Amino acid sequence: HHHHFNLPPGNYKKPVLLYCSNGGHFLRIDPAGTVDGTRDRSDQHIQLQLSAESVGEVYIKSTETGQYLAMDTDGLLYGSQTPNEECLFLERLEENHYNTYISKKHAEKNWFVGLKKNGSCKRGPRTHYGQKAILFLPLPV
């Protein structure tokens, strides 16, 4: 393990919005496979369903399009039509409160899912422990 194992409470029984407190955006997976954040809670591409592959390891899927959130070899988030190794994330508790998602494939490099204040996704190498961009709260739909 390259990381701690403090896990968040709550389960995967229902779909959630992944809210980034950094700029106040909900994680959005566009039908074209594009990923970013939006502040519009009426958007139909921010509803996500998480599922556990192993304890603490999850897939994050758009309920609207069925796409899986994934992080590519250069650190960019994208929507994948099929589940692959780039779609698994280590879900952890952070600052005793928030949920963070580390790319399993690139866990040794500490590449996180994160949104900037302007709503754009952060590239894996630009993320790290301590940033506000990596902190999410799973709000009920």
Side-chain angles (χ1 to χ4, degrees), residues 94-95 112 128-135:
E94 184 56 275
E95 280 166 31
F112 295 84
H128 53 259
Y129 276 118
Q131 298 178 323
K132 299 306 176 192
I134 67 170
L135 309 170

Side-chain angles (χ1 to χ4, degrees), residues 11-54:
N11 52 44
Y12 308 118
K13 268 180 158 52
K14 292 201 279 56
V16 300
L17 304 180
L18 280 187
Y19 179 78
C20 190
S21 47
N22 187 30
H25 297 89
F26 302 107
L27 188 60
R28 176 174 52 180
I29 304 171
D30 185 276
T34 308
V35 180
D36 73 345
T38 180
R39 293 206 188 83
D40 176 17
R41 191 176 171 165
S42 73
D43 194 287
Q44 294 299 288
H45 298 113
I46 54 158
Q47 295 78 18
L48 309 170
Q49 179 62 63
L50 279 62
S51 52
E53 186 66 71
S54 291

Side-chain angles (χ1 to χ4, degrees), residues 29 35 60 67-72 75-80 82 84-89 113:
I29 304 171
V35 180
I60 290 160
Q67 294 174 91
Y68 294 76
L69 183 72
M71 182 179 276
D72 75 21
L76 297 178
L77 295 177
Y78 73 98
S80 183
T82 50
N84 57 47
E85 289 172 19
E86 305 186 325
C87 303
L88 286 176
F89 295 92
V113 168

Side-chain angles (χ1 to χ4, degrees), residues 46-120:
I46 54 158
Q47 295 78 18
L48 309 170
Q49 179 62 63
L50 279 62
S51 52
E53 186 66 71
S54 291
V55 175
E57 286 190 359
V58 303
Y59 287 132
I60 290 160
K61 298 178 58 188
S62 160
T63 59
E64 187 62 39
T65 68
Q67 294 174 91
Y68 294 76
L69 183 72
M71 182 179 276
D72 75 21
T73 192
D74 281 311
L76 297 178
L77 295 177
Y78 73 98
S80 183
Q81 297 289 145
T82 50
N84 57 47
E85 289 172 19
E86 305 186 325
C87 303
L88 286 176
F89 295 92
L90 307 178
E91 179 188 65
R92 295 293 178 277
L93 184 69
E94 184 56 275
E95 280 166 31
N96 303 94
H97 180 66
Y98 301 98
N99 284 17
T100 55
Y101 294 89
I102 294 180
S103 159
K104 178 174 180 186
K105 178 70 166 149
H106 301 280
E108 66 308 310
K109 304 187 278 281
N110 291 22
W111 287 8
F112 295 84
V113 168
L115 296 173
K116 294 172 55 55
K117 293 174 179 50
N118 66 9
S120 69

